[PDB]
Every structure is written in C-alpha cells, then in structure tokens.
Amino acid sequence: EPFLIGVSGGTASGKSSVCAKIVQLLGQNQKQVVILSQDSFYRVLTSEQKAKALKGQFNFDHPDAFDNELILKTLKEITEGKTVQIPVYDFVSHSRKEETVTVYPADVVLFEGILAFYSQEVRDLFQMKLFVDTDADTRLSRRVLRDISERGRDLEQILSQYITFVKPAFEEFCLPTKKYADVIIPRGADNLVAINLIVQHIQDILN
Amino acid sequence: GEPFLIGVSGGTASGKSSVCAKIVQLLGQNEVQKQVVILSQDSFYRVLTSEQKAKALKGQFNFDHPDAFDNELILKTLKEITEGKTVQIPVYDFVSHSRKEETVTVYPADVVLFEGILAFYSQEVRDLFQMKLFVDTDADTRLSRRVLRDISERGRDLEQILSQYITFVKPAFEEFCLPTKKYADVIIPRGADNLVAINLIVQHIQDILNG
Amino acid sequence: GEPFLIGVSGGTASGKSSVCAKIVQLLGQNEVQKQVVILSQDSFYRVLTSEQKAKALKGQFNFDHPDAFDNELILKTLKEITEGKTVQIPVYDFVSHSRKEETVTVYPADVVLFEGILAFYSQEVRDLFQMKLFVDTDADTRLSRRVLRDISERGRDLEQILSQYITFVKPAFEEFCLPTKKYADVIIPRGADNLVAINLIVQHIQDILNG
Amino acid sequence: EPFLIGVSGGTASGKSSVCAKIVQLLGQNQKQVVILSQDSFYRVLTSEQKAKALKGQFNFDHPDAFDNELILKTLKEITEGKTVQIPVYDFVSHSRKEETVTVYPADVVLFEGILAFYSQEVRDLFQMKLFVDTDADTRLSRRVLRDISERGRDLEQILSQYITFVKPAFEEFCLPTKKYADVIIPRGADNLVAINLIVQHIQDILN
Ligand SMILES: N=[N+]=N[C@@H]1[C@H](O)[C@@H](COP(=O)(O)O)O[C@H]1n1ccc(=O)[nH]c1=O
Ligand SMILES: N=[N+]=N[C@@H]1[C@H](O)[C@@H](COP(=O)(O)O)O[C@H]1n1ccc(=O)[nH]c1=O
Ligand SMILES: N=[N+]=N[C@@H]1[C@H](O)[C@@H](COP(=O)(O)O)O[C@H]1n1ccc(=O)[nH]c1=O
Ligand SMILES: N=[N+]=N[C@@H]1[C@H](O)[C@@H](COP(=O)(O)O)O[C@H]1n1ccc(=O)[nH]c1=O
Ligand SMILES: [Mg+2]
Ligand SMILES: [Mg+2]
Ligand SMILES: [Mg+2]
Ligand SMILES: [Mg+2]
C-alpha cells in the first residue's frame, strides 16, 4: 500500500519545492516516490466558462474549479496499488489535453495543491497532511514573476486577478484547511529542520 | 493655542497618506473651521554623496534604512511646529537624489499630521506626537499597491523593484518599523477603508480641540 | 432591543479579560444603566476521550488548536444570544478535562462580550460580532504573565509549561490567531493599560446604544 | 591585523551561539579565532552598588554597568596585534576575580554583548557588525531557564527583574544599535543561510 501525503498552502508558498526536498532527503540514507499536483485536475471548461476565463471573469481558486470526482477516483486507485493515468492541463489554454501520464505504483505519493485538504473524502485518504506557510508578499512576488514567465501575461491583469480571486479564495477556502494538517511548515522549503523531522517520520512509518 | 501633532506610521503602501487625507476630510466636514497640514517623512531624505549615488545606480543603496533620513532635521522641524513656529521643509528630487534650492513654507495649524514608515523609530520624535496611529495593512495588498506605484516610472524594471522590495523594503519593515508598533495609541487594520476606526479617531481629535 | 455582541481576541495573557472588564467598568461609570455580560471561549472546550486524556497526561495534546473547542456549540450559543434568547453555557473541569453536570444560565444583556484567542477564527462566529477588538500585547510581556498564571497550579512544572508554550501555544498563536487580526475593527496595543483606545471604544458603544 | 567582528542582540537571542557557528563553519574549508563576551567586562561594584544588586535594585543592562574604558583599551590593543589579559567576572557574586585569561593574537576576533555597539569608539573598532534578532518570548523562555540553572535564582525574581530592567533597557539602549549592524540575522543561529553568507564574506576579506 502506498503511503500518500497531502500537501497544501497558498499560491507560491513552496508546496512543490517542499515535496521535492522530501524526495531528495528520502533517497539519501530505494523507496520510490512520485509527486502529483492538483493543478493537473482542473475541470473541463464549457465554451461559456472558457469565454469568462479569457475575459478574466473565472475563479480558478474556487473548489468547484477542480475535478474533485476525478481526484477522488485517481487517488482511490493509487491507494489500492493500481496504475493510473493522469490528465495534463494547459493553464494558458484552459484545456485538458488528450495525452495522459502513466503513474506506476510507488511507496510514497505526494499530492500537492492549494485545496488538497478541502474535500473531506480526499482529505481522509492522506495518511499525512502538511501545510506550507509563507509570507503573503513573499508569495505574491513569486506569484507575479512566475505568472509573467509561465504564461506571458500582463502585470495589471495579474494583480487584478490576484485581488479579485486568489487572495479572497485563499482566506475563504484554503486557509481554513490549515487546521487539518499534521505538520505546519513556516518559511516553506527553507525550514530544513521541519522537513528533516517529516522525512524521518516517513522513514520510520515505512520500517 | 498650540498645534496638535499626530504621528502616523505603517508599512509601505499601508494607507498612511490616505488615512491622513480621510482624517482631514472628516475634520472639515464635521466642523461647526480647523486648519490642518500633512507632512511626510519622504521629504526628509538625506542628500547622497556621489559614492552613495553610485551604489544607488547599482541598486545597492538601502533607502528604507534609518540612516537614509535626516532625523536631526526631522526632530528640529517637528520641535518647532509644536512650539507654533513656522518651518521650511526641503524638496527632494529623487532622480537627482538631492535637495532642490527651493524649500516649502509650512505654517502652524490646529492639527499637524506626520506620516512615515519610520515615524516612531526615534524616541525623541516619537514623544513629540500627542497621538500616534499605526496603519496595519497587509504584505500582499501593500506589495501590489507598491509595485503599481513604483512601476509608473519609465526606467523602473519590474524585477528591479520586486528585488529591492525583497532585499531592502520587506526586511527594513520587520527590523525597524514593526518594533515601534506598540507605541501607537491606536492600530488601524485595513487602512483608510476602516471608517469605524477613523471616525473614532477624528471624534477623539475634535474633543481635544474643544477642551 | 437586541443585544450588542462584541468579540475580543488576542494572544494568551494579552489582556482580553481585563479589556472587557475595563469596558464594563467604564460603561457603568459613564451611564446617565446598561446590563452587560462577559463570555469566555475557555468555557467551550471539548470533552476529551480517554485516549486524548492519555496524550494530555503525556503533555501531547494541543489545547490551543481549533479542534480543541466546541465551535458548533460556540456558534449555536452566540447565535441565540444575538436573537435575545437565554442560553446555558457549560462548566469545564480542567483536571477532569470534562464538562460538569451543572450549566450556567446566561441571560441576554445590552452588551455581550466574548473573549478568546480564537474568537475570530471561524467566519460564521466572526460575523455575529457587531464590533471586533484585538488586544495586541507582546510575547515576552504575555509569556511572563502566562507563566505565573499557569504556575499557580500545584503540579505544573516550570519546564513543562515553558515547553508546552514553545510547542503548542506560540505556534498556534501564529498559525490560527494572528491571521484573524485583519478582521478586527480596532487593534489595541498594550491591552488594558491603553485607556486612550478603550475610552474611544466605550464611547463608540454608548453612541450605538443611544441610536 | 586581527579582523574583529562585533555581535549584539537582546538577551538570549543567540549571540554566543552565532559566533560559535561562525567559527565552526570557518574552520572547515587554519585561521585562528577567539570569542570575547561583553559580560566579562562588568564594572567593579562598590559596597553600596553591591548591596543594591543583592536587593535586586541594580540595572545590569544599562551601558554604565560595563567597564567601557577597559573594553575600549582591551579591544584597542587586540587590533594592534598585542596579547591581552581578560578579566573574569562572577554574575552570582558581582565581583571581578583576580585571575585573568590570556588571549593571544588571532586572525578573527568575535566580540559578543548586548551593548557591543552602544559606545561609538568601541563601535568603530569592528570591521563588521552583526545583530542577532529573535522573538521576545523565545528569548525570555531561554532567559528564564538559563537564569534558573546558571544562578539558582527564584522565578518571581527573574520575571520581576526582566520587566523592571532587562526589557526597558533593551528597548532604550540595545535595540537602537540595530541600525549600526552590517548584517541582521533573524532566527539567530537557526539562520544558517545568513551565517553562511557571513562566513564566506569573512573568508574573502582575509584572502
Ligand atoms: N488565475 N488564477 N489563479 C490560480 C491559482 O492561484 C493557481 C494555483 O496555485 P499554485 O499553482 O501556486 O499552487 O492556479 C492559478 N492559475 C493561474 C493562471 C491560469 O491561467 N490558470 C490558473 O489556474
Ligand atoms: N526603493 N525603495 N524604497 C523606498 C521607500 O520604502 C519608499 C518610502 O515611501 P513609501 O511609504 O511609498 O514606501 O520610497 C522608496 N524610494 C526611496 C528612494 C528613491 O529614490 N525611490 C524610492 O522609490
Ligand atoms: N496548555 N495550554 N494551553 C491553554 C490555552 O492556550 C489557554 C487558553 O487561555 P489563555 O487566554 O489564558 O491562554 O488555556 C490553556 N490550558 C488549556 C487546557 C488545560 O487543561 N490547561 C490549560 O492551561
Ligand atoms: N540582571 N540582569 N540582567 C542581565 C542581562 O540581561 C545579561 C546580559 O545579557 P546576555 O548574557 O543574554 O547577552 O546579564 C544579566 N545578568 C543576570 C544575572 C546577574 O546576576 N547578572 C547579570 O548581569
Ligand atoms: Mg503547483
Ligand atoms: Mg505615503
Ligand atoms: Mg482570559
Ligand atoms: Mg553571553
């Protein structure tokens, strides 16, 4: 049975880097590990919803924006040792592509996303839940640079979409889930002492 | 017969200037008038040596550090305003990073509002304030306003000010501004949009002015 | 004809109970009277399972965590007080970590003050408050008061509560209480010794009660 | 010429551990290093001042409580390559003992104390100035445990001496000196990234 860990936190808090660090420190001193991200499981937009998204009028930080049924199904079979296929989604296009990614059974499975703990059925599947905590302006400055490079978008649009959707959804949806975490990590990936404790806690659950 | 000096502080783009503006508008609207003037710490920068202007061109000068401001001039100016004297304040050209020859004459008023990220840093200036307010707005709300404010300049690269913020502005806020927070009489969450708190401050000022 | 509900929060030993006491004393002293009652979040702890009481004996139970409190009961009780109903609040025995059979009858009042480190955590409870205050006292002032408060118990080892503070209380304050700070109408530095801020709060309450 | 570094910060902020870390990370990848502490240079108390100290009525966090002339003299000769003798002071007794400690010339000299940057003449002797920054309650909890073990004193006395003398003197005397530091270290000795930058900055000033 795979030991799967939920990881959450606000945007640009360092969730994906925290898991990458967990793998790198797990490999030294072979348990096989795979990292899935909730951003892969965005919903299939209709043409109306797609038009709203191009007008900047769609909330992609709302729980309903994620294919929670597919997340629950994909995670369910992973816990049952099966091989799963994982969608690939294009943030620029807001489309789920036809190609998928094969994920073979592993010993540890990190699932990363801003709302990984929102759904109770999904939440109870994680044997361990981590919440990454980072200063808001630090996250925003990472968010702004990331969104300029990763999608070539305008600065006035990033800041207006942040204030309209990202920040309110963080406070209404993501931040309340912090109470479900087993370990809260301040300073994100820079908290190597916290990560070390987590890594050794994983290693001795597997022994 | 003596001016009522009010100190306002808080992080960059927390709403220090707006909160003072709102106070001024609410003072005159609820009058019966009272003369009130607004000063800003950003007028009292030190004139840089060409050695320091060189570091500034390389982006290696901390403008958010206490050493960047003429505190001797800040204290002297505020000490004279409290005593009812008329002061001359300098005008700083930021491209040149120097003081122009012109000054600005600031006459005494019933209320004198001084705003600055480091308004409460020095104990001598902090004690001149008969009321001290702290605007508590939030890093990501403040940063987003700070960026669009700073990007209105022609040569300001985005990654330049995003890096000067992380290197200088955010640390200096936590190292020098936040410790002064305790000294405030009142801490205003969410800045100028907090009319509940600002209404109570304005009505507290009116009571002091009316004996 | 409906009770005015006021939420007070802040860290441990910040002065939440004193600030409410000062407000109550100042309300009656400046009257003409108004009935006002004080509730505390520490009455609404969950009753522990003997599995959890075991972890508590080992010092491995987080009493500063949101899960440690009966928020369903907190919201239901406060919802009924706002509607003018009369509520029964439980009495918690902390040695036993259980609710006694006795309740306490709390009648509606003109002003209802609810104090708690996590008073503003849940949005549904936070919205019941027509006024929200945050006491901002300081870690070392608060810790020193917290220790002498907690050491008045016979079996409380010093290094036990100094370790439960570092492990549970200080993190929970930063993880769950501080984010709610923005929602307050007014943030009071230095707690109950800040009579400037408390006087403006009390006079703001009087105005609401007088139409 | 020795390269001497001033280190300051509030009580129990980790000043002495920060320098110890600096030495340990300097030795690996031999430059010889010695750590002096300002607590060694407390003044010679008269019998009146000593009586006040036993009654808990003496401010040991005030700049006048330190033999600033001896500090300036001792540091002056160290910069001039000479060998110096260093007093030893007993906090329990409030006495300067007759024995001294010989300090032979070194390549780097760390000087640690809560008011190391207060005196301007002393301050200008440091080629590098560090300020250690730590949460107040974290420092106090370290202060309380340290003062119970190190001097066997009563808890009510520690907390009353802290509120009366230590905390006010920190805000009036020590904290303003933070503006003189070249590097401010948040989280104290846990900020290994900040320390690393300092260590490499020292190594390349010596090369
Ligand atoms: N728009 N928007 N908000 C989003 C949310 O912050 C992020 C998920 O957060 P994180 O990847 O940092 O864990 O997906 C973001 N996002 C951004 C651009 C886009 O085109 N689509 C999209 O989903
Ligand atoms: N760079 N930088 N930091 C600065 C400081 O934080 C700010 C003070 O004003 P506020 O309250 O808007 O942040 O002015 C900024 N500043 C200073 C000098 C300069 O030449 N240009 C400039 O933008
Ligand atoms: N331990 N611990 N943390 C507690 C929490 O922070 C505090 C809440 O009240 P305040 O505002 O005084 O901190 O009660 C403390 N608490 C809780 C349960 C218990 O059995 N004993 C106890 O002291
Ligand atoms: N009393 N008192 N305050 C002191 C100050 O906090 C400390 C210097 O701080 P730090 O050692 O943490 O750098 O010396 C302390 N101190 C304590 C006990 C004593 O008997 N003598 C003494 O000087
Ligand atoms: Mg991601
Ligand atoms: Mg301004
Ligand atoms: Mg209380
Ligand atoms: Mg020491």
PDB file of C-alpha atoms and ligand atoms in Angstrom, chain B residues 16-17 40 42 115 149, ligand 6:
ATOM      1  CA  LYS B  16      -0.696  56.272   5.721  1.00  0.00           C
ATOM      2  CA  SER B  17      -1.358  59.168   3.334  1.00  0.00           C
ATOM      3  CA  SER B  40       5.610  63.233   5.006  1.00  0.00           C
ATOM      4  CA  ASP B  42       9.768  61.100   2.458  1.00  0.00           C
ATOM      5  CA  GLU B 115       3.273  60.212   8.134  1.00  0.00           C
ATOM      6  CA  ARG B 149       3.046  52.852  -7.625  1.00  0.00           C
TER       7      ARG B 149
HETATM    8 MG    MG E   6       2.661  57.921   1.815  1.00  0.00          MG
END
